[PDB]
């Protein structure tokens, strides 16, 4: 810098240590591998992600879990409210009279506003559970929409009630959460660190935000085997597989991931093996022959519903049936993603 | 009754269009059909910034008119000297998913925010070297689509949750909330004298908000598709609107009506920023063809094209002077064009 | 806050050695070039030495260059500067002064306190003189104080290169004026000034008893940065 001065030979040299911090900057960048989980219902439940999280050994403190005391409560009343109005677009009276007025003091509570459990609410609640007809209409889940762990919390509400009440790892697993914004795990394996970007949660145009990943290795998707005769009381008689079906093909079809591995994961294995034995898939999907009673006939019948959405027939999907319990998840995720890697070498290098 | 009132509101719109039909006496285009065109724009890029290693999504000049900063996905927020393509700091955001940028007029002061829904500032002039956060603003549900400081101590920031609020950047607490809008908010002007704002939203409609009293005055609904851009005309008494459509469209504030349509065959993208000349005579418009356009705001005819980038041109601002143009761009360079 | 606070001084045979270091607390070290001045006994001030932002940069004074060394160490914050071939000229305090070059910064706005240094018994560049030595001056009266340059100090990109200081009795120097206009951060607005190519001034209206003391012109046009004799002010 013949011409330039004594001061603006030390800016210049300001801006070439700038340059080298981004540099730096950049090669720790690369060395990290964006997944995008992609929120589903199974997803907008947000439990699995938790106990995937309790597989890694993450774990709650007092403090954690003082945070999901108030949620624990607040899902007793929103099931139970829930219930309520499935029994009215159901038309089973109750059994009991005097459940018709502990009906309308549940239906008249506010859900947010609840931060303690009242005295008068536990045994309302506690007598409506004990109403045979709303044992009945427990039976009949499938039909309308409910949380999963309704049993459970409703079956130990004295522990709850009490006044003096820390919940446990399990309470704390399955309190259905919707989430405000981007929420990123980091997890490292052999030498390579991923970041899984779950957006869930967004509720906002995916039109205006989908192309800031554009550019990731893969986009999962989670969606739930127990799903197949579950009709919402929101939908008028739509099958909510079917609705995952369509967001699966929505998704997939996106020009922004035409470079992006897709994976899949199909979770609650367990609960298909139970809802099988009464639940037969043919009643809801005609295409099913099989054996009308086997499990793995319809996960690979549910299996391949999925991977025939593929727009391309070149491009892998990648699968694996995840029971809640599994230690495999983390695995799998890093030999797909070095199989996605693999592949797009050989399209590189011009050997496929 | 919900009836009484569906039936109210369609009898007052179309109050409301009769009312504009009636204050229509000629269109734009037919008083400037006498006046000379303004001839081919050539510019030529002076400049190229290079370092940002991820697609830039905003920008934004100073007021000085030499000083810029732009953002840029790989968290980095970056303030240039545009005379000497110098870097006169670095910032790291702590989330890397920002699609917004504000330079503070005074010049102490950096807004960014993203898909985190909350809005961070950023002090340049402190004195212990480092640039460091001095606020983070979050009340918004949504992602933030943008920002524009009203002062040192005011900032107007837009959400996809449908709402713009006013804050108090002292106090951390959005004093004004303005919720007319019922699809996400993606662009945001503010008027030259700082009393008024225009928002456009993906419901098609831009609405002028009134900064003091909190409420909507005007609300304009000629476009098809969502708006992605809005910039207000330097008089201060129109402004210009960038959607999805490839049309940008020009609405007066006095007339309450559409002036002009700025539209070709050929462009069938969406229009991602919109920025005026210092005259008003040129509107620049970047487009997702991967070039940017230049029309005459008066007879709408298209005048020039700046065709340096080659991916998306993201963003587009002109200095305070007139000197420059700036456009960023989604294969990370900015360029400098005059 | 931003506290630099040298050690290292002391007396020192002639032709021994001794090395000086200036610890710096609450600011970004790492990011700010550092340099050694140096003040006479009874005489001005003079330039000793200069390191950059990482280290990629070092001048010396023609004086000293070839006996003087000055390193930082950035991780530790730390700034030394070893001294061998101990000369009669070597008595001086030695300042420690910051400063941070980007569009827009103020050099030379944090001083150190300075350590004594004690030893028993202008060729090719610019000088800046003051041609005044004592203006004593009632307190609400406007003072305005001249310098010279030996060339013009106005650069092509269109900055002026002068900086004003100022040295109260018992006080380390602090920067009042950069780039013959600018006020520094902190200091009141009675202080302006203006200047041509070669000839600048310095200008204090109302003036205060704490304005009171020696005042010293600087140029950073080229290396290396030459002072002024500098101008005092007492009270009548």
């Known amino acids: 810098g013949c011409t330039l001065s004594a001061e603006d030979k030390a800016a210049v040299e300001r801006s070439k240590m700038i340059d080298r911090n981004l540099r730096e900057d950049g090669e720790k960048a690369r060395r990290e591998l964006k997944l995008l989980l992609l929120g589903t219902g199974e997803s907008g439940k947000s439990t699995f992600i938790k106990q995937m999280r309790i597989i890694h050994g993450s774990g709650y403190s007092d403090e954690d879990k003082r945070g999901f005391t108030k949620l624990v409560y607040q899902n007793i009343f929103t099931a139970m409210q829930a219930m309520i109005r499935a029994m009215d677009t159901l038309k089973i009276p109750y059994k009991y009279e005097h459940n018709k007025a502990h009906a309308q003091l549940v239906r008249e509570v506010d859900v947010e506003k609840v931060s303690a459990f009242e005295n008068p609410y536990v045994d309302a609640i506690k007598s409506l559970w004990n109403d045979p007809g709303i044992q009945e209409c427990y039976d009949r889940r499938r039909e309308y929409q409910l949380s999963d762990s309704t049993k459970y919390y409703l079956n130990d509400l004295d522990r709850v009630a009490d006044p003096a009440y820390l919940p446990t790892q399990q309470d704390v697993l399955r309190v259905q959460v919707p989430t405000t914004g981007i929420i990123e795990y980091p997890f490292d394996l052999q030498s390579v660190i991923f970041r899984m970007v779950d957006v869930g949660g967004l509720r906002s145009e995916r039109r205006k935000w989908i192309h800031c990943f554009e550019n990731v290795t893969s986009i999962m998707f989670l969606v739930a085997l127990s799903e197949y005769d579950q009709v919402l009381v929101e939908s008028d008689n739509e099958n909510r597989m079917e609705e995952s079906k369509a967001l699966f093909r929505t998704i997939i079809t996106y020009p922004w991931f035409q470079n992006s591995s897709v994976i899949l994961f199909l979770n609650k294995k367990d609960l298909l093996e139970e809802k099988i034995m009464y639940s037969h898939l043919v009643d809801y999907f005609p295409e099913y022959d099989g054996p009308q009673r086997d499990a793995q006939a319809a996960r690979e019948f549910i299996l391949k519903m999925f991977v025939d959405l593929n727009p391309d027939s070149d491009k892998i999907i990648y699968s694996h049936f995840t029971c809640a319990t599994d230690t495999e998840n983390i695995r799998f995720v890093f030999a797909a993603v070095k199989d996605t890697i693999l592949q797009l070498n050989l399209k590189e290098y011009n050997l496929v | 009754e919900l009836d009484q009132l569906r039936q109210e509101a369609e009898q007052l719109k179309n109050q409301i269009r009769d009312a504009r039909k009636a204050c229509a006496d000629a269109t734009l285009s037919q008083i400037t059909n006498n006046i000379d065109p303004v001839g081919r724009i050539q510019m030529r890029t002076r400049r190229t910034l290079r370092g940002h290693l991820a697609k830039i999504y905003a920008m934004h000049w100073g007021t000085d008119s030499r000083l810029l900063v732009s953002a840029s996905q790989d968290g980095k927020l970056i303030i240039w000297d545009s005379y000497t393509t110098n870097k006169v700091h670095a910032i790291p955001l702590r989330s890397s998913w920002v699609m917004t940028c504000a330079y503070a007029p005074s010049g102490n002061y950096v807004a960014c925010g993203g898909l985190d829904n909350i809005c961070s500032i950023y002090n340049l002039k402190t004195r212990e070297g480092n640039v460091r956060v001095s606020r983070e603003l979050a009340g918004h549900t949504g992602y933030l689509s943008c920002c524009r400081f009203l002062d040192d101590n005011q900032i107007v920031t837009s959400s996809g949750d449908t709402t713009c609020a006013l804050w108090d950047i002292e106090t951390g607490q959005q004093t004004t909330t303005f919720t007319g809008h019922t699809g996400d908010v993606m662009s945001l002007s503010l008027a030259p004298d700082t009393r008024l704002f225009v928002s456009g939203a993906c419901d098609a409609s831009a609405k002028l908000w009134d900064v003091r009293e909190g409420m909507c005055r005007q609300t304009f609904t000629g476009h098809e598709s969502d708006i992605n851009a809005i910039c207000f005309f330097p008089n201060g008494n129109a402004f210009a609107t960038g959607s999805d459509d490839a049309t940008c469209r020009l609405f007066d504030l006095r007339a309450d009506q559409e002036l002009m349509t700025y539209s070709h065959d050929n462009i069938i993208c969406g229009i991602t920023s919109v920025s005026f000349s210092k005259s008003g005579r040129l509107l620049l418009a970047g487009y997702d063809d991967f070039n940017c356009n230049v029309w005459d705001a008066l007879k709408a005819d298209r005048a020039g094209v700046l065709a340096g980038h080659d991916n998306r041109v993201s963003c587009l601002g002109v200095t305070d002077d007139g000197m420059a143009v700036a456009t960023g761009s989604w294969d990370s360079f900015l360029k400098i064009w005059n | 806050d931003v506290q630099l606070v040298e050690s290292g001084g002391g007396l020192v045979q002639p032709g021994g050695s001794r090395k000086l270091s200036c610890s710096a607390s609450?600011?970004?070290?790492?990011?700010?070039?550092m340099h050694w001045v140096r003040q006479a006994p009874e005489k001005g001030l003079e330039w000793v030495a200069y390191?950059?932002?990482?280290?990629?940069?070092?001048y010396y004074a023609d004086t000293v260059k070839g006996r003087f060394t000055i390193s930082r160490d950035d991780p530790k914050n730390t700034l030394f500067l070893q001294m061998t071939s101990l000369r009669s000229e070597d008595t001086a305090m030695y300042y420690c002064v910051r400063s941070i070059y980007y569009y827009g910064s103020s050099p030379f706005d944090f001083w150190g306190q300075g350590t004594t240094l004690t030893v028993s018994s202008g060729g090719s560049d610019i000088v800046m003189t003051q041609a005044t030595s004592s203006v004593p001056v009632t307190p609400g009266e406007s003072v305005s104080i001249s310098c010279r340059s030996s060339k013009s100090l106005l650069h092509s990109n269109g900055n002026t290169y002068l900086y004003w200081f100022l040295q109260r009795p018992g006080q380390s120097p602090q920067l009042l004026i950069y780039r013959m206009s600018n006020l520094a951060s902190g200091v009141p607005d009675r202080f302006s000034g203006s200047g041509s190519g070669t000839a600048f001034t310095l200008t204090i209206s109302r003036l205060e008893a704490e304005d009171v003391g020696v005042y010293y012109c600087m140029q950073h046009l080229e290396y290396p940065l030459t002072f002024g004799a500098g101008t005092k002010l007492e009270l009548k």
């Open positions: 390191i950059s932002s990482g280290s990629g940069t070092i």
């Open positions: 609450g600011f970004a070290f790492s990011s700010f070039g």
